[PDB]
Design a protein around this ligand. Sequence first.
Ligand SMILES: NC(=O)c1ccc[n+]([C@@H]2O[C@H](COP(=O)([O-])OP(=O)(O)OC[C@H]3O[C@@H](n4cnc5c(N)ncnc54)[C@H](O)[C@@H]3O)[C@@H](O)[C@H]2O)c1
Ligand SMILES: NC(=O)c1ccc[n+]([C@@H]2O[C@H](COP(=O)([O-])OP(=O)(O)OC[C@H]3O[C@@H](n4cnc5c(N)ncnc54)[C@H](O)[C@@H]3O)[C@@H](O)[C@H]2O)c1
Lengths: 359, 358
Amino acid sequence: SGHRFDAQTLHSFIQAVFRQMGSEEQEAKLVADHLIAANLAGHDSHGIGMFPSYVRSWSQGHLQINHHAKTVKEAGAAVTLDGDRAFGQVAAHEAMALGIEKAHQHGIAAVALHNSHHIGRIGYWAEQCAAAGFVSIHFVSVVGIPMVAPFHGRDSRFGTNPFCVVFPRKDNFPLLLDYATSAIAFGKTRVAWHKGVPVPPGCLIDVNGVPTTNPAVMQESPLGSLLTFAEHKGYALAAMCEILGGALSGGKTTHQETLQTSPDAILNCMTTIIINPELFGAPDCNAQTEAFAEWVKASPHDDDKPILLPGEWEVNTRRERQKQGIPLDAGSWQAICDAARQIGMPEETLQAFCQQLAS
Amino acid sequence: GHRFDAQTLHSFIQAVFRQMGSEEQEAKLVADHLIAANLAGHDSHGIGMFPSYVRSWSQGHLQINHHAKTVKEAGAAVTLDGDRAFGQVAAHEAMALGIEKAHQHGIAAVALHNSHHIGRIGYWAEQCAAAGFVSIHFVSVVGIPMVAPFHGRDSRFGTNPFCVVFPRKDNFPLLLDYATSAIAFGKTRVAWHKGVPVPPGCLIDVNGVPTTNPAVMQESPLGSLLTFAEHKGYALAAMCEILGGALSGGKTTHQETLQTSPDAILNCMTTIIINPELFGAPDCNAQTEAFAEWVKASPHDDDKPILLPGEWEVNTRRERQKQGIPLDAGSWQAICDAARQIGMPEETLQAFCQQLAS
Ligand SMILES: NC(=O)c1ccc[n+]([C@@H]2O[C@H](COP(=O)([O-])OP(=O)(O)OC[C@H]3O[C@@H](n4cnc5c(N)ncnc54)[C@H](O)[C@@H]3O)[C@@H](O)[C@H]2O)c1
Ligand SMILES: NC(=O)c1ccc[n+]([C@@H]2O[C@H](COP(=O)([O-])OP(=O)(O)OC[C@H]3O[C@@H](n4cnc5c(N)ncnc54)[C@H](O)[C@@H]3O)[C@@H](O)[C@H]2O)c1
C-alpha cells in the first residue's frame, strides 16, 4: 500500500534530511536535486531510497559529508579529479562543470573522476552535458564490490559498471543511452525479492554458478551473482568500463586489495568524453536524425508498446510523475522515515513534513 | 572445405583486386584488411566479401580507385567523404588523419560518411591502439534495414557496430568490437547453409513472430534480426545511427535512403581518439593487470576459460597463422567465380589454386 508524493514537497523533505545529516546548504541541494531527478525519471534505485544507505556509509567512515572533488592533474584537454569520497551528487556535478568548461575551450575534452562516493543515475551527468549543447560518453566502474560474473565465470568479479552516451537535440529531449552492463539492475532483484516474484531467465546464477530466476540469491546468503547482458557483449563492455573508468581515471579497479569492507561503501570512478557536435561537417544532421526517429517509430507494434527513442522512457515517466506524484512503496518510505529519526530529525519535524506531503 | 596459408591467400586476394582494376596500394589495403579479418576469426568480413564487392561495383555502388576527401576541418575534428571508395581505403585514410590530429590535439575526432563497407571495426581501432591511443567508434550501415527496434516487428536499421579499444604496452589491446544485433547476419547465413536453428531470441519472421529459423534472413519473405538484450542493443544501435550516420555528415536509414541492392553496403563511422597519457593515472597499468588476473580467477570450466575483450581474436590469429585460414567450399567457389567474372584468366586463377593447394 504505497503513496504518491508531490515532487516539490518531497525534494524539500530530502533536502531537510541531508541538512539534518550535517550537509551544508549547497551540498544538501545538490544531493536532493539528483535524487529527486532519479525518482522523476523512473530510476527509483538511485532516488530518495538511497538515503538510508548513504547514512550507513557515512557512519562507517566511507562517504564523507561536505567534501569536494580535487584536481590532481590538468593536461591539455583532460582534467583528472579525486572525488575524495564526497557525495557523488557533489563530486560528479563539480566534474561535469569543469569538463563542460574544458570542452568550451578545446571543442573536445575529457574529465576523469576517481574515488567519488556513489554518483547515482549516470544519465543525469549526461543531461548536464547535453543541456550545455555537447555529446558526452561516460565509462563508469563500481570500486571493489563484486556483483557481476564475467562471461564463462561462476562468481562475482566486478560491479554493475554502467555505460552512458547522449546526443543533444535543439528544442527536444536528448537521445540518451544509460544502463548497467549487467543483465538486470541490482535494484530490480531487490524489488522482485520484496514482491516474492521471479526475475526473467538468463540474469542470475546462484552461489554454485547454476542459472536461477530466484532473486533471493542477490538479497540473502549464500550470495549468487548477476550475469552480464548478452553474454560476452555486456561482459566486454563491463570490462571496458572497469579499465576506462576505474584504471584510466587514476582510480582503483576491483581485485583482492581493493574490495570494500561494507556493502554501503559505494564508490564510483567515471571517465567522461565531452564533444562539441558542431565541429563536424554535418549540415543535414537535424533532418537526418528526425527522419530516422520518424522511420524507426513506424515499425509495426502493439498499441500498448510503441517504439521509444533512447531517453524517451525517462522523459515520459518524468511527465507522468510531475503530474501524478512520485510513487514510493510503503517499506522504502518507512525505512526513509526511520533513518531520518535515527540521524536526529525531531519527530515533530517529520510529522510536519508528512502533513505537507499528505496534501 | 580447405585450409589456406595466409600469406599465399593474401597474394591471391591482392591480385584479384588488381584484376578488378585497383591500383597497387588500393589492392594492398583491401587485401591487408580482408586477410586480417580471416586471421582474427571474423570470416564474414574477410576474403568472402569479394563476391559481394564485385556485385556492388557492377551495380555502381562500390567505386574502385577512390579516396576519402576532407570536407571539413575545425579544431580537433576532421570530417571526410569516403566517395564510396573501398572502406579498406577510406577508413585507413580516416584513421591516419585522425591519429595525426590526436597527436596535435591530445583528443581528436574523425567522422567518415559515405564510405563503402568498412568491414571489421576492430581493425581501425587496432591502428589507433598501435599508435598509443584509446579510440571509440560509432558505426552505421546506410539504408539497409536488417534489425528491428525493440517493440517493432520489422527491420528499420543496420547491424550498426560499436567499438572501443584500450592500448597496453607490449600486450594485445583490450578491444570491444561487435554488432548491436542479437546475432551476426553471417551466422544466420552459415546456419542456413548447414540447415540448423540459430539460438532463440535472435530473429523474428515477416509477421514479427519469434523464430529460430535462419531461412527468414536468407529467403523471401524476409524477417528480421533482433537487437542484443532488447532495449539495450536497440538504444546502442540508435546512438550508432545518429552519432555515426547523422553526425558524420552522412545519411540515416529511412524510406528515401534505402539502397536498391543488398550488396550496396555503405558505412558511416564517427571515431573519437584519446591520448590516455593525458590522465593523471600513474597506477593505470598495475590496476589494469590486477583486474585482468582477478577476473580470470573466477571458477570456470578448463575448456572455457575467461578471456579479456580482444583476446579471442588474438588467440584465433595465432592458431590461423600456424594452421592456415579455413574457408568453406561454397565460399571458395563463389570467390573463384567472382574472379572469372572480373576477367582473371583461367590459367592465372589455376596457378593460384595450385599454389594454395600445396
Ligand atoms: N552509479 C552506479 O554505479 C550505477 C550502477 C549501475 C546502474 N546505475 C544506473 O541505474 C539506472 C538503471 O540501470 P539499468 O541497467 O536498469 O537501465 P535500464 O534497463 O532501465 O535502461 C535504461 C536505458 O534504456 C533506455 N530505454 C528504456 N526503454 C526503452 C525502449 N523501449 N526503447 C529504447 N530505449 C529504452 C532508457 O532511455 C535508458 O537509456 C541507470 O540510470 C544507470 O545509470 C548506476
Ligand atoms: N557494417 C559493418 O562494417 C559491420 C556490421 C556489423 C558487424 N561488423 C563486424 O562484425 C564482427 C562480428 O560482430 P559480432 O557482433 O558478431 O561480434 P562477436 O559476437 O563475435 O563479438 C566480438 C567481441 O566480443 C569479444 N569476445 C568474444 N568472446 C569473448 C569472451 N568469451 N569474453 C570477452 N569478450 C569476448 C571479442 O573480443 C570482440 O570484442 C565485428 O568485427 C564487427 O565490427 C561490421
